[PDB]
């Protein structure tokens, strides 16, 4: 895959906020900290309300490429 | 051997394609570039902000394995 | 592909109208123009009304084998 | 296919009526005419009615293994 | 740690006639004992019980499941491998 | 596998409680006992009511990776 590697690699190093849409329709958000041939490591640091104050929770989840339908970043970018 | 050309045709000829996903989602745009396992689809979305229409370029990396069918706008013959 | 490549070559060369059922339910109709190891190119003249006249549209769609469940030809076929 | 081939090759030989359940919940009944590495030619000997006349078709649909969840034969069978 | 786990787990599930639940991705639950498996299918035997003319009838049911349609396989009792 | 095996292996070594989301929507909780190229052996210790007292039931599923949506660890995990 001579395009997928650059593209992710780009999105990761430039810390590009992305939406990962899953085949089951679930939308993940956040940044590609890392990836390999079969998985993306995706960190999202969304805000949260814990007992009437604003906490920010950083859950990082490994998402299987084979369950991703599309990867639509927040801003377009190009490869080396 | 059929896939690459059909794609590579649509890419260079930059014909707008409708690519239906397995879940039924219909994505439209132009094939900027494709890979063994992914298609980079380019589209210019239209948004309404403060009355007037504003547009920008959205680029989607689409996994081939979530795609069912690809319907181009106009039929195309291979090279 | 002892059974597949013939059963499509026979379907392709003999221009048999085929139903393609997709895993997701939606049914495609039309003739196999051409296929490779992962895709089928299915061409189909349709029947459309625009401005009170039956107009026919020839639509060609590359359909990923991996979204296909079953392909049912219009008339029984044989191979060598 | 130490197990899959023998088993499939059995049910074609002994012309064993099989139900094939697809991943999407579809159930096909029929006899395994042929199969290869990725596909199964399922012959269905199905009666039906057309406008108050019994009409018996014989349809040979090619099924992609990747759409099959389970194949359930009508009689228990075994192989070497 | 490549393909060491799948066989041993299955292979001791089969060899020790352990009852297993097989959950298909589509949400179907299949119960039975693993008779055998290759790289791509497991052969699941169970005994089905129907009623014919108001008397019990046991039948042996043996179905070939594709692993690519299996989500998870949960034995009825803990097992361990070599 | 330069990210997946490491990420998995430290989830396993540090007995991190993990939630495994399936493509079909099912959430599986537990911890990675072992994992393969294609399966995760996931152990779950849950409390179950037996005869008016509470008893922990240990359950161990072999999960197929290809049915896994996403792997959400209980807490952050940094690899070597």
GROMACS .gro file of C-alpha atoms in nm:
model
  481
    1UNK     CA    1   0.000   0.000   0.000
    2UNK     CA    2   0.213   0.287  -0.150
    3UNK     CA    3  -0.051   0.564  -0.061
    4UNK     CA    4  -0.203   0.450   0.278
    5UNK     CA    5   0.143   0.460   0.453
    6UNK     CA    6   0.238   0.817   0.341
    7UNK     CA    7  -0.121   0.944   0.413
    8UNK     CA    8  -0.145   0.807   0.771
    9UNK     CA    9   0.228   0.882   0.833
   10UNK     CA   10   0.147   1.244   0.718
   11UNK     CA   11  -0.171   1.270   0.936
   12UNK     CA   12   0.028   1.132   1.239
   13UNK     CA   13   0.352   1.343   1.221
   14UNK     CA   14   0.149   1.670   1.151
   15UNK     CA   15  -0.095   1.565   1.438
   16UNK     CA   16  -0.398   1.610   1.202
   17UNK     CA   17  -0.737   1.569   1.378
   18UNK     CA   18  -0.925   1.288   1.182
   19UNK     CA   19  -1.269   1.116   1.181
   20UNK     CA   20  -1.243   0.731   1.146
   21UNK     CA   21  -1.590   0.613   1.022
   22UNK     CA   22  -1.639   0.240   1.097
   23UNK     CA   23  -1.831  -0.003   0.867
   24UNK     CA   24  -2.084  -0.053   1.157
   25UNK     CA   25  -2.141   0.328   1.121
   26UNK     CA   26  -1.966   0.430   1.454
   27UNK     CA   27  -1.752   0.750   1.416
   28UNK     CA   28  -1.421   0.767   1.608
   29UNK     CA   29  -1.235   1.104   1.637
   30UNK     CA   30  -0.888   1.224   1.745
   31UNK     CA   31  -0.524   1.187   1.633
   32UNK     CA   32  -0.316   0.896   1.494
   33UNK     CA   33  -0.042   0.866   1.762
   34UNK     CA   34   0.083   0.543   1.583
   35UNK     CA   35  -0.010   0.271   1.326
   36UNK     CA   36   0.112  -0.053   1.156
   37UNK     CA   37  -0.024  -0.262   0.861
   38UNK     CA   38  -0.342  -0.386   1.042
   39UNK     CA   39  -0.419  -0.128   1.322
   40UNK     CA   40  -0.441   0.248   1.401
   41UNK     CA   41  -0.364   0.376   1.755
   42UNK     CA   42  -0.618   0.664   1.794
   43UNK     CA   43  -0.609   0.910   2.093
   44UNK     CA   44  -0.911   1.143   2.162
   45UNK     CA   45  -0.882   1.402   2.449
   46UNK     CA   46  -1.252   1.521   2.460
   47UNK     CA   47  -1.389   1.726   2.759
   48UNK     CA   48  -1.627   1.565   3.019
   49UNK     CA   49  -1.855   1.684   3.311
   50UNK     CA   50  -1.755   1.506   3.641
   51UNK     CA   51  -1.979   1.620   3.936
   52UNK     CA   52  -2.038   1.975   3.793
   53UNK     CA   53  -1.685   2.064   3.662
   54UNK     CA   54  -1.500   2.037   3.324
   55UNK     CA   55  -1.250   1.741   3.314
   56UNK     CA   56  -1.071   1.640   2.987
   57UNK     CA   57  -1.038   1.255   2.940
   58UNK     CA   58  -0.757   1.110   2.713
   59UNK     CA   59  -0.862   0.750   2.617
   60UNK     CA   60  -0.634   0.589   2.349
   61UNK     CA   61  -0.786   0.287   2.163
   62UNK     CA   62  -0.637   0.047   1.903
   63UNK     CA   63  -0.878   0.027   1.605
   64UNK     CA   64  -0.847  -0.257   1.348
   65UNK     CA   65  -0.801  -0.121   0.989
   66UNK     CA   66  -1.040  -0.398   0.866
   67UNK     CA   67  -1.331  -0.229   1.060
   68UNK     CA   68  -1.261   0.126   0.921
   69UNK     CA   69  -1.471   0.225   0.613
   70UNK     CA   70  -1.323   0.581   0.569
   71UNK     CA   71  -1.060   0.821   0.726
   72UNK     CA   72  -1.175   1.188   0.669
   73UNK     CA   73  -0.933   1.446   0.820
   74UNK     CA   74  -1.036   1.794   0.949
   75UNK     CA   75  -0.801   1.963   0.694
   76UNK     CA   76  -0.664   1.822   0.364
   77UNK     CA   77  -0.281   1.756   0.344
   78UNK     CA   78  -0.033   1.607   0.093
   79UNK     CA   79   0.253   1.352   0.112
   80UNK     CA   80   0.635   1.395   0.068
   81UNK     CA   81  -0.552  -0.616  -1.393
   82UNK     CA   82  -0.914  -0.485  -1.447
   83UNK     CA   83  -0.939  -0.289  -1.114
   84UNK     CA   84  -0.621  -0.071  -1.150
   85UNK     CA   85  -0.701   0.047  -1.507
   86UNK     CA   86  -1.076   0.112  -1.432
   87UNK     CA   87  -0.954   0.316  -1.130
   88UNK     CA   88  -0.644   0.469  -1.301
   89UNK     CA   89  -0.875   0.566  -1.595
   90UNK     CA   90  -1.125   0.745  -1.357
   91UNK     CA   91  -0.822   0.909  -1.176
   92UNK     CA   92  -0.643   1.059  -1.486
   93UNK     CA   93  -0.983   1.135  -1.663
   94UNK     CA   94  -1.088   1.280  -1.317
   95UNK     CA   95  -1.453   1.165  -1.372
   96UNK     CA   96  -1.683   1.209  -1.067
   97UNK     CA   97  -1.763   0.862  -0.912
   98UNK     CA   98  -2.038   0.743  -0.671
   99UNK     CA   99  -1.878   0.471  -0.445
  100UNK     CA  100  -2.138   0.278  -0.238
  101UNK     CA  101  -2.011   0.128   0.091
  102UNK     CA  102  -2.135  -0.201   0.242
  103UNK     CA  103  -2.333  -0.011   0.513
  104UNK     CA  104  -2.523   0.176   0.231
  105UNK     CA  105  -2.329   0.507   0.272
  106UNK     CA  106  -2.298   0.669  -0.076
  107UNK     CA  107  -1.973   0.868  -0.122
  108UNK     CA  108  -1.931   1.093  -0.427
  109UNK     CA  109  -1.618   1.271  -0.547
  110UNK     CA  110  -1.310   1.235  -0.769
  111UNK     CA  111  -1.038   0.970  -0.731
  112UNK     CA  112  -0.733   1.186  -0.644
  113UNK     CA  113  -0.521   0.866  -0.597
  114UNK     CA  114  -0.560   0.492  -0.519
  115UNK     CA  115  -0.356   0.217  -0.354
  116UNK     CA  116  -0.368  -0.166  -0.339
  117UNK     CA  117  -0.609  -0.146  -0.035
  118UNK     CA  118  -0.735   0.221  -0.037
  119UNK     CA  119  -0.882   0.492  -0.265
  120UNK     CA  120  -0.817   0.858  -0.184
  121UNK     CA  121  -1.145   1.032  -0.280
  122UNK     CA  122  -1.148   1.413  -0.330
  123UNK     CA  123  -1.471   1.618  -0.304
  124UNK     CA  124  -1.555   1.989  -0.252
  125UNK     CA  125  -1.825   2.009   0.022
  126UNK     CA  126  -2.072   2.305   0.037
  127UNK     CA  127  -2.148   2.464   0.379
  128UNK     CA  128  -2.387   2.748   0.487
  129UNK     CA  129  -2.226   2.992   0.736
  130UNK     CA  130  -2.360   3.349   0.796
  131UNK     CA  131  -2.604   3.337   0.499
  132UNK     CA  132  -2.370   3.274   0.200
  133UNK     CA  133  -2.252   2.928   0.077
  134UNK     CA  134  -1.884   2.852   0.165
  135UNK     CA  135  -1.699   2.553   0.011
  136UNK     CA  136  -1.376   2.365   0.087
  137UNK     CA  137  -1.193   2.045  -0.028
  138UNK     CA  138  -1.252   1.726   0.177
  139UNK     CA  139  -1.010   1.431   0.118
  140UNK     CA  140  -1.124   1.083   0.233
  141UNK     CA  141  -0.897   0.777   0.244
  142UNK     CA  142  -1.148   0.495   0.171
  143UNK     CA  143  -1.063   0.131   0.254
  144UNK     CA  144  -1.141  -0.085  -0.053
  145UNK     CA  145  -1.282  -0.362   0.178
  146UNK     CA  146  -1.571  -0.137   0.298
  147UNK     CA  147  -1.668  -0.058  -0.068
  148UNK     CA  148  -1.942  -0.264  -0.242
  149UNK     CA  149  -1.971  -0.089  -0.583
  150UNK     CA  150  -1.826   0.216  -0.769
  151UNK     CA  151  -2.069   0.392  -1.014
  152UNK     CA  152  -1.901   0.659  -1.231
  153UNK     CA  153  -2.107   0.957  -1.368
  154UNK     CA  154  -2.038   0.869  -1.738
  155UNK     CA  155  -1.942   0.521  -1.875
  156UNK     CA  156  -1.565   0.492  -1.962
  157UNK     CA  157  -1.377   0.239  -2.186
  158UNK     CA  158  -1.044   0.088  -2.058
  159UNK     CA  159  -0.708   0.175  -2.225
  160UNK     CA  160  -1.063  -2.046  -0.908
  161UNK     CA  161  -1.120  -2.378  -1.101
  162UNK     CA  162  -1.502  -2.312  -1.080
  163UNK     CA  163  -1.515  -1.924  -1.059
  164UNK     CA  164  -1.310  -1.798  -1.362
  165UNK     CA  165  -1.492  -2.038  -1.604
  166UNK     CA  166  -1.842  -1.974  -1.455
  167UNK     CA  167  -1.780  -1.597  -1.518
  168UNK     CA  168  -1.592  -1.638  -1.855
  169UNK     CA  169  -1.898  -1.847  -1.967
  170UNK     CA  170  -2.131  -1.574  -1.822
  171UNK     CA  171  -1.915  -1.292  -1.977
  172UNK     CA  172  -1.864  -1.434  -2.334
  173UNK     CA  173  -2.229  -1.564  -2.357
  174UNK     CA  174  -2.356  -1.218  -2.227
  175UNK     CA  175  -2.604  -1.386  -1.981
  176UNK     CA  176  -2.804  -1.131  -1.776
  177UNK     CA  177  -2.705  -1.198  -1.407
  178UNK     CA  178  -2.850  -1.091  -1.068
  179UNK     CA  179  -2.567  -1.005  -0.821
  180UNK     CA  180  -2.688  -1.019  -0.457
  181UNK     CA  181  -2.461  -0.817  -0.221
  182UNK     CA  182  -2.394  -0.928   0.141
  183UNK     CA  183  -2.590  -0.607   0.244
  184UNK     CA  184  -2.905  -0.718   0.050
  185UNK     CA  185  -2.914  -0.466  -0.244
  186UNK     CA  186  -2.946  -0.657  -0.579
  187UNK     CA  187  -2.755  -0.553  -0.896
  188UNK     CA  188  -2.877  -0.676  -1.242
  189UNK     CA  189  -2.696  -0.677  -1.582
  190UNK     CA  190  -2.425  -0.850  -1.792
  191UNK     CA  191  -2.064  -0.922  -1.677
  192UNK     CA  192  -1.857  -0.709  -1.922
  193UNK     CA  193  -1.529  -0.804  -1.748
  194UNK     CA  194  -1.387  -0.926  -1.409
  195UNK     CA  195  -1.043  -0.986  -1.244
  196UNK     CA  196  -0.938  -1.160  -0.914
  197UNK     CA  197  -1.130  -0.904  -0.690
  198UNK     CA  198  -1.389  -0.713  -0.908
  199UNK     CA  199  -1.662  -0.758  -1.172
  200UNK     CA  200  -1.753  -0.482  -1.424
  201UNK     CA  201  -2.137  -0.507  -1.459
  202UNK     CA  202  -2.292  -0.302  -1.749
  203UNK     CA  203  -2.672  -0.249  -1.755
  204UNK     CA  204  -2.913  -0.071  -1.991
  205UNK     CA  205  -3.202   0.053  -1.766
  206UNK     CA  206  -3.549   0.205  -1.849
  207UNK     CA  207  -3.603   0.570  -1.738
  208UNK     CA  208  -3.883   0.832  -1.789
  209UNK     CA  209  -3.761   1.191  -1.840
  210UNK     CA  210  -4.010   1.446  -1.992
  211UNK     CA  211  -4.270   1.181  -2.090
  212UNK     CA  212  -4.036   0.960  -2.304
  213UNK     CA  213  -3.892   0.615  -2.216
  214UNK     CA  214  -3.516   0.678  -2.236
  215UNK     CA  215  -3.265   0.398  -2.172
  216UNK     CA  216  -2.941   0.452  -1.972
  217UNK     CA  217  -2.636   0.218  -1.989
  218UNK     CA  218  -2.475   0.220  -1.637
  219UNK     CA  219  -2.140   0.039  -1.572
  220UNK     CA  220  -2.030  -0.024  -1.207
  221UNK     CA  221  -1.710  -0.202  -1.082
  222UNK     CA  222  -1.845  -0.426  -0.795
  223UNK     CA  223  -1.596  -0.564  -0.533
  224UNK     CA  224  -1.636  -0.948  -0.519
  225UNK     CA  225  -1.602  -0.922  -0.134
  226UNK     CA  226  -1.940  -0.737  -0.108
  227UNK     CA  227  -2.107  -1.015  -0.317
  228UNK     CA  228  -2.297  -1.306  -0.155
  229UNK     CA  229  -2.451  -1.492  -0.454
  230UNK     CA  230  -2.463  -1.438  -0.839
  231UNK     CA  231  -2.783  -1.591  -0.998
  232UNK     CA  232  -2.784  -1.604  -1.382
  233UNK     CA  233  -3.115  -1.552  -1.578
  234UNK     CA  234  -3.082  -1.890  -1.762
  235UNK     CA  235  -2.893  -2.205  -1.646
  236UNK     CA  236  -2.537  -2.216  -1.798
  237UNK     CA  237  -2.269  -2.487  -1.851
  238UNK     CA  238  -1.885  -2.477  -1.880
  239UNK     CA  239  -1.631  -2.716  -2.045
  240UNK     CA  240  -0.834  -2.735   0.342
  241UNK     CA  241  -0.753  -3.068   0.523
  242UNK     CA  242  -1.124  -3.062   0.647
  243UNK     CA  243  -1.324  -2.819   0.421
  244UNK     CA  244  -1.243  -2.986   0.082
  245UNK     CA  245  -1.313  -3.351   0.187
  246UNK     CA  246  -1.643  -3.242   0.356
  247UNK     CA  247  -1.764  -3.035   0.054
  248UNK     CA  248  -1.642  -3.308  -0.191
  249UNK     CA  249  -1.848  -3.563   0.013
  250UNK     CA  250  -2.182  -3.371  -0.004
  251UNK     CA  251  -2.147  -3.319  -0.385
  252UNK     CA  252  -2.066  -3.695  -0.439
  253UNK     CA  253  -2.354  -3.821  -0.212
  254UNK     CA  254  -2.582  -3.539  -0.356
  255UNK     CA  255  -2.665  -3.432   0.007
  256UNK     CA  256  -2.934  -3.160   0.037
  257UNK     CA  257  -2.763  -2.869   0.229
  258UNK     CA  258  -2.893  -2.548   0.389
  259UNK     CA  259  -2.624  -2.271   0.350
  260UNK     CA  260  -2.666  -1.980   0.598
  261UNK     CA  261  -2.509  -1.652   0.480
  262UNK     CA  262  -2.345  -1.400   0.718
  263UNK     CA  263  -2.646  -1.165   0.655
  264UNK     CA  264  -2.889  -1.434   0.790
  265UNK     CA  265  -3.000  -1.556   0.440
  266UNK     CA  266  -3.056  -1.939   0.420
  267UNK     CA  267  -3.010  -2.115   0.080
  268UNK     CA  268  -3.126  -2.481   0.052
  269UNK     CA  269  -2.988  -2.680  -0.246
  270UNK     CA  270  -2.739  -2.952  -0.354
  271UNK     CA  271  -2.366  -2.876  -0.394
  272UNK     CA  272  -2.316  -2.923  -0.771
  273UNK     CA  273  -1.957  -2.778  -0.756
  274UNK     CA  274  -1.716  -2.568  -0.547
  275UNK     CA  275  -1.355  -2.440  -0.558
  276UNK     CA  276  -1.127  -2.244  -0.317
  277UNK     CA  277  -1.364  -1.937  -0.287
  278UNK     CA  278  -1.705  -2.030  -0.446
  279UNK     CA  279  -1.987  -2.288  -0.424
  280UNK     CA  280  -2.223  -2.368  -0.715
  281UNK     CA  281  -2.552  -2.442  -0.527
  282UNK     CA  282  -2.822  -2.615  -0.744
  283UNK     CA  283  -3.177  -2.558  -0.603
  284UNK     CA  284  -3.462  -2.790  -0.723
  285UNK     CA  285  -3.746  -2.551  -0.615
  286UNK     CA  286  -4.123  -2.575  -0.692
  287UNK     CA  287  -4.325  -2.245  -0.707
  288UNK     CA  288  -4.664  -2.112  -0.844
  289UNK     CA  289  -4.716  -1.868  -1.140
  290UNK     CA  290  -5.083  -1.744  -1.161
  291UNK     CA  291  -5.241  -2.074  -1.035
  292UNK     CA  292  -4.991  -2.307  -1.216
  293UNK     CA  293  -4.722  -2.513  -1.030
  294UNK     CA  294  -4.388  -2.418  -1.207
  295UNK     CA  295  -4.061  -2.602  -1.106
  296UNK     CA  296  -3.732  -2.412  -1.180
  297UNK     CA  297  -3.374  -2.550  -1.144
  298UNK     CA  298  -3.141  -2.253  -1.060
  299UNK     CA  299  -2.756  -2.279  -1.025
  300UNK     CA  300  -2.631  -1.978  -0.818
  301UNK     CA  301  -2.254  -1.931  -0.751
  302UNK     CA  302  -2.208  -1.843  -0.374
  303UNK     CA  303  -1.883  -1.680  -0.243
  304UNK     CA  304  -1.760  -1.872   0.068
  305UNK     CA  305  -1.690  -1.529   0.233
  306UNK     CA  306  -2.075  -1.477   0.255
  307UNK     CA  307  -2.138  -1.823   0.417
  308UNK     CA  308  -2.149  -1.848   0.802
  309UNK     CA  309  -2.241  -2.222   0.828
  310UNK     CA  310  -2.329  -2.511   0.587
  311UNK     CA  311  -2.580  -2.753   0.758
  312UNK     CA  312  -2.638  -3.082   0.566
  313UNK     CA  313  -2.978  -3.265   0.598
  314UNK     CA  314  -2.816  -3.601   0.697
  315UNK     CA  315  -2.512  -3.650   0.926
  316UNK     CA  316  -2.223  -3.764   0.698
  317UNK     CA  317  -1.854  -3.842   0.750
  318UNK     CA  318  -1.529  -3.855   0.552
  319UNK     CA  319  -1.189  -4.022   0.604
  320UNK     CA  320   0.283  -1.528   1.911
  321UNK     CA  321   0.148  -1.609   1.558
  322UNK     CA  322  -0.115  -1.892   1.522
  323UNK     CA  323   0.018  -2.079   1.836
  324UNK     CA  324  -0.304  -1.997   2.029
  325UNK     CA  325  -0.583  -2.081   1.775
  326UNK     CA  326  -0.512  -2.459   1.728
  327UNK     CA  327  -0.402  -2.549   2.086
  328UNK     CA  328  -0.719  -2.379   2.224
  329UNK     CA  329  -0.942  -2.543   1.959
  330UNK     CA  330  -0.724  -2.859   1.959
  331UNK     CA  331  -0.775  -2.916   2.338
  332UNK     CA  332  -1.145  -2.804   2.306
  333UNK     CA  333  -1.192  -3.084   2.042
  334UNK     CA  334  -0.968  -3.356   2.205
  335UNK     CA  335  -1.142  -3.309   2.549
  336UNK     CA  336  -1.499  -3.308   2.397
  337UNK     CA  337  -1.564  -2.971   2.581
  338UNK     CA  338  -1.909  -2.819   2.502
  339UNK     CA  339  -1.856  -2.479   2.321
  340UNK     CA  340  -2.080  -2.177   2.236
  341UNK     CA  341  -1.990  -2.020   1.892
  342UNK     CA  342  -2.113  -1.658   1.846
  343UNK     CA  343  -2.135  -1.561   1.473
  344UNK     CA  344  -2.068  -1.194   1.382
  345UNK     CA  345  -2.440  -1.173   1.282
  346UNK     CA  346  -2.537  -1.248   1.647
  347UNK     CA  347  -2.635  -1.619   1.594
  348UNK     CA  348  -2.525  -1.844   1.890
  349UNK     CA  349  -2.424  -2.202   1.787
  350UNK     CA  350  -2.380  -2.468   2.064
  351UNK     CA  351  -2.195  -2.803   2.022
  352UNK     CA  352  -1.864  -2.995   2.051
  353UNK     CA  353  -1.578  -2.932   1.799
  354UNK     CA  354  -1.539  -3.256   1.597
  355UNK     CA  355  -1.249  -3.116   1.387
  356UNK     CA  356  -1.120  -2.790   1.226
  357UNK     CA  357  -0.879  -2.683   0.948
  358UNK     CA  358  -0.729  -2.333   0.887
  359UNK     CA  359  -1.068  -2.182   0.773
  360UNK     CA  360  -1.355  -2.402   0.919
  361UNK     CA  361  -1.442  -2.578   1.248
  362UNK     CA  362  -1.676  -2.887   1.224
  363UNK     CA  363  -1.940  -2.848   1.505
  364UNK     CA  364  -2.144  -3.157   1.609
  365UNK     CA  365  -2.441  -3.126   1.850
  366UNK     CA  366  -2.755  -3.339   1.909
  367UNK     CA  367  -3.088  -3.172   1.812
  368UNK     CA  368  -3.420  -3.284   1.977
  369UNK     CA  369  -3.749  -3.232   1.781
  370UNK     CA  370  -4.105  -3.370   1.834
  371UNK     CA  371  -4.247  -3.598   1.556
  372UNK     CA  372  -4.606  -3.736   1.612
  373UNK     CA  373  -4.582  -3.671   1.992
  374UNK     CA  374  -4.261  -3.869   2.072
  375UNK     CA  375  -3.901  -3.737   2.132
  376UNK     CA  376  -3.655  -3.772   1.838
  377UNK     CA  377  -3.277  -3.716   1.887
  378UNK     CA  378  -3.081  -3.628   1.566
  379UNK     CA  379  -2.701  -3.571   1.527
  380UNK     CA  380  -2.649  -3.228   1.355
  381UNK     CA  381  -2.298  -3.163   1.208
  382UNK     CA  382  -2.243  -2.814   1.047
  383UNK     CA  383  -1.925  -2.666   0.888
  384UNK     CA  384  -1.879  -2.309   1.031
  385UNK     CA  385  -1.642  -2.062   0.854
  386UNK     CA  386  -1.405  -1.895   1.107
  387UNK     CA  387  -1.454  -1.565   0.909
  388UNK     CA  388  -1.819  -1.570   1.034
  389UNK     CA  389  -1.719  -1.652   1.397
  390UNK     CA  390  -1.683  -1.355   1.641
  391UNK     CA  391  -1.605  -1.557   1.961
  392UNK     CA  392  -1.605  -1.921   2.095
  393UNK     CA  393  -1.684  -1.964   2.471
  394UNK     CA  394  -1.642  -2.311   2.630
  395UNK     CA  395  -1.901  -2.424   2.895
  396UNK     CA  396  -1.607  -2.480   3.140
  397UNK     CA  397  -1.250  -2.338   3.175
  398UNK     CA  398  -0.977  -2.513   2.965
  399UNK     CA  399  -0.597  -2.461   2.932
  400UNK     CA  400  -0.345  -2.558   2.655
  401UNK     CA  401   0.008  -2.711   2.646
  402UNK     CA  402   0.246  -0.610   1.339
  403UNK     CA  403   0.522  -0.368   1.473
  404UNK     CA  404   0.248  -0.179   1.674
  405UNK     CA  405  -0.031  -0.446   1.726
  406UNK     CA  406   0.186  -0.720   1.897
  407UNK     CA  407   0.370  -0.474   2.132
  408UNK     CA  408   0.041  -0.287   2.221
  409UNK     CA  409  -0.138  -0.621   2.277
  410UNK     CA  410   0.160  -0.779   2.464
  411UNK     CA  411   0.184  -0.495   2.727
  412UNK     CA  412  -0.201  -0.501   2.776
  413UNK     CA  413  -0.139  -0.875   2.855
  414UNK     CA  414   0.182  -0.839   3.072
  415UNK     CA  415   0.031  -0.548   3.277
  416UNK     CA  416  -0.307  -0.735   3.304
  417UNK     CA  417  -0.481  -0.409   3.191
  418UNK     CA  418  -0.860  -0.444   3.206
  419UNK     CA  419  -0.962  -0.395   2.834
  420UNK     CA  420  -1.304  -0.336   2.665
  421UNK     CA  421  -1.313  -0.505   2.315
  422UNK     CA  422  -1.581  -0.358   2.079
  423UNK     CA  423  -1.700  -0.605   1.807
  424UNK     CA  424  -1.794  -0.489   1.450
  425UNK     CA  425  -2.148  -0.615   1.538
  426UNK     CA  426  -2.165  -0.372   1.837
  427UNK     CA  427  -2.103  -0.622   2.127
  428UNK     CA  428  -1.872  -0.476   2.401
  429UNK     CA  429  -1.647  -0.753   2.552
  430UNK     CA  430  -1.472  -0.666   2.885
  431UNK     CA  431  -1.185  -0.870   3.039
  432UNK     CA  432  -0.805  -0.893   3.006
  433UNK     CA  433  -0.580  -1.044   2.736
  434UNK     CA  434  -0.455  -1.383   2.872
  435UNK     CA  435  -0.291  -1.472   2.536
  436UNK     CA  436  -0.319  -1.356   2.171
  437UNK     CA  437  -0.232  -1.497   1.827
  438UNK     CA  438  -0.196  -1.348   1.475
  439UNK     CA  439  -0.580  -1.399   1.435
  440UNK     CA  440  -0.726  -1.453   1.791
  441UNK     CA  441  -0.716  -1.289   2.139
  442UNK     CA  442  -0.777  -1.522   2.440
  443UNK     CA  443  -0.972  -1.281   2.671
  444UNK     CA  444  -1.035  -1.373   3.041
  445UNK     CA  445  -1.327  -1.206   3.231
  446UNK     CA  446  -1.395  -1.247   3.610
  447UNK     CA  447  -1.758  -1.140   3.679
  448UNK     CA  448  -1.977  -1.165   3.995
  449UNK     CA  449  -2.283  -1.399   3.951
  450UNK     CA  450  -2.566  -1.475   4.202
  451UNK     CA  451  -2.581  -1.844   4.311
  452UNK     CA  452  -2.841  -1.939   4.579
  453UNK     CA  453  -2.860  -1.604   4.768
  454UNK     CA  454  -2.475  -1.552   4.780
  455UNK     CA  455  -2.240  -1.384   4.521
  456UNK     CA  456  -1.974  -1.600   4.341
  457UNK     CA  457  -1.711  -1.474   4.088
  458UNK     CA  458  -1.752  -1.670   3.755
  459UNK     CA  459  -1.429  -1.687   3.544
  460UNK     CA  460  -1.512  -1.702   3.166
  461UNK     CA  461  -1.244  -1.726   2.889
  462UNK     CA  462  -1.345  -1.644   2.523
  463UNK     CA  463  -1.123  -1.692   2.215
  464UNK     CA  464  -1.208  -1.375   2.017
  465UNK     CA  465  -1.136  -1.362   1.642
  466UNK     CA  466  -0.945  -1.036   1.563
  467UNK     CA  467  -1.142  -0.999   1.233
  468UNK     CA  468  -1.468  -0.945   1.435
  469UNK     CA  469  -1.302  -0.678   1.660
  470UNK     CA  470  -1.399  -0.315   1.592
  471UNK     CA  471  -1.168  -0.147   1.848
  472UNK     CA  472  -0.963  -0.235   2.165
  473UNK     CA  473  -1.020   0.027   2.445
  474UNK     CA  474  -0.781  -0.022   2.743
  475UNK     CA  475  -0.902   0.056   3.102
  476UNK     CA  476  -0.613   0.310   3.134
  477UNK     CA  477  -0.321   0.451   2.930
  478UNK     CA  478  -0.042   0.203   2.829
  479UNK     CA  479   0.304   0.304   2.691
  480UNK     CA  480   0.506   0.045   2.486
  481UNK     CA  481   0.890  -0.004   2.487
   0.00000   0.00000   0.00000
